[PDB]
């Protein structure tokens, strides 16, 4: 039997609002380590990988590993019913077709029973890598940039070097160029660059990733030449949420 308790209800609320629009259905693998989820969007152009460490929960129990086929859109509606101060409890039975979420007002206790589903999932083997460039910057800055360049073009040419990073777009009105410089804690831009990289990515997908902004004050972009981009949001003392984006050409 599985039963995890999260005193910070918001974390799970935000995690779901950050995913629901990019991925509709996904498998939630529960194990003693914690909650894990890997899923590609419909077009397979992007991948998400969530990791909520058991140590991040006040209470966590998992007798047997569970793989629950979940409809993120339905779970999103259910979590919308929680308050940002509610203590969220997750409880599931080994032979169960449902997931039970319990919201405790910080004398109001809500209890939902979400129906699960069957899912013909496809997961990928992503080995540990060390990227040519790793930018750490404020998630707010990242979200503003992506959104702004959207009014200019469809793709963004991210150029990373040791001095700073540059995002550019081009369209039928002209072009745009946003240059960030390394800063001399949450308002800093640092670059662990080994080799310069310049990649082209679809802004449409990046603006989905940025919905994970409320999860962290900072975001880190890992770019290696000819590989998918990794935009990671560290959920404070829980784990993280990563979004991979297939490069163009």
């Amino acid at each position: 039997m599985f039963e995890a308790r999260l005193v910070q209800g918001s974390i799970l609320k935000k995690v779901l609002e950050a995913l629901k629009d990019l991925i509709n259905e996904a498998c939630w693998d529960i194990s003693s380590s914690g909650v894990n989820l890997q899923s590609m969007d419909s077009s397979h152009v992007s991948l998400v990988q969530l990791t909520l460490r058991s140590e991040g929960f006040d209470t966590y129990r998992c007798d047997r590993n569970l793989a629950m086929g979940v409809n993120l859109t339905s779970m999103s509606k259910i979590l919308k019913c929680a308050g940002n101060e509610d203590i969220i409890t997750l409880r599931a039975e080994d032979n169960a077709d449902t997931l039970a979420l319990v919201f405790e007002a910080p004398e109001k206790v809500s209890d939902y029973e979400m129906k699960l589903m069957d899912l013909d999932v496809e997961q990928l083997g992503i080995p540990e890598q060390e990227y040519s460039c790793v930018v750490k910057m404020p998630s707010g800055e990242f979200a503003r940039i992506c959104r702004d360049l959207s009014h200019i073009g469809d793709a963004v040419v991210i150029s990373c070097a040791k001095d700073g990073v540059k995002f550019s777009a081009s369209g039928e009105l002209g072009n745009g160029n946003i240059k960030l410089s390394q800063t001399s804690e949450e308002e800093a831009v640092t670059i662990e660059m080994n080799e310069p990289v310049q990649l082209t990515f679809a802004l449409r997908y990046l603006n989905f990733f940025t919905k994970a902004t409320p999860l962290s004050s900072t975001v880190t972009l890992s770019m290696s030449a000819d590989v998918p981009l990794v935009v990671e949001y560290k959920i404070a003392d829980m784990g993280h949420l990563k979004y991979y984006l297939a490069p163009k050409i």
Binding site: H44, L47, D97, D118, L119, D120, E122, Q123
Partner: peptide
């Protein structure tokens, strides 16, 4: 040309019964 994640990483399909 927009590439897809399956062009860079090995995929293994899984059937979820729940």
């Amino acid at each position: 040309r927009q590439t897809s994640m399956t062009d860079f990483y090995h995929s293994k399909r899984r059937l979820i019964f729940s």
